[PDB]
Ligand binder design. Sequence first.
Ligand SMILES: COC(=O)Nc1ccc(-c2cnn([C@H](CC3CC3)c3ccc(-c4c(-n5cnnn5)ccc(Cl)c4F)c[n+]3[O-])c2)cc1
Length: 236
Amino acid sequence: IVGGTASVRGEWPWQVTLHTTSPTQRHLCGGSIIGNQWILTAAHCFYGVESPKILRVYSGILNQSEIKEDTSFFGVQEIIIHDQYKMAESGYDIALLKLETTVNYTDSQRPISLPSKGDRNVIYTDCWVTGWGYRKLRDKIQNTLQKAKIPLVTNEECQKRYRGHKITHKMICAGYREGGKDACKGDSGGPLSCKHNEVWHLVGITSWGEGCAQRERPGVYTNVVEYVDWILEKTQ
Ligand SMILES: COC(=O)Nc1ccc(-c2cnn([C@H](CC3CC3)c3ccc(-c4c(-n5cnnn5)ccc(Cl)c4F)c[n+]3[O-])c2)cc1
């Protein structure tokens, strides 16, 4: 997260850190708890992943340095990548992880609601992007979960900034005209969370952008509301 600030324990209880264990253990991507056995993340995260055997999902983490050889985690039973996914910039950047067991919800690990049926025309003004990613294009993974408030921008403005890409209704863009706050390397797969009527909704999945926090270059997110049917079909 560029231009962000440190989170506190319990602040974003749906945020998970997805680790790979090959060839060494390390944070790979963010993700969001959306059900007791279900993580929503980005399909791009699994480019190099030979199978679910090498994944570990950690919840209730604030600092990466909390994770030791005895820290409990959830195994991944299945990776479900949208069957049209090809690359992040062309969309469908969405995946479900089915965990090997059910999360017991606690203060530190809680689900975030999907965008609600009938909210298709809500104007979200309180959106936040979170993660352990770089603070700049050439940085390192951050020990403490970072947060930044970023405004949504219209797809029409987003397309004008990305004339080499097809910005579709299955994408949602967010960023400041002058840059300064954005996701960056290591944040993808995590949530763009928006609070409406004091309820958090998983509005976006951190996906791609040209640079990090550049002027006139919004971050691009998977538009979760357009995948609710697909999620419900996979999880039901
Ligand atoms: C020691 O290093 C470790 O152990 N960890 C470590 C873990 C992951 C990575 C790493 C590198 N890239 N990525 C992902 C894509 C990869 C498949 C996972 C990625 C792509 C794009 C964006 C992104 C951007 N950016 C544009 N330019 N950069 N960011 C802008 C806006 C928005 Cl909205 C964005 F989403 C964010 N991420 O995360 C992850 C590096 C090191």
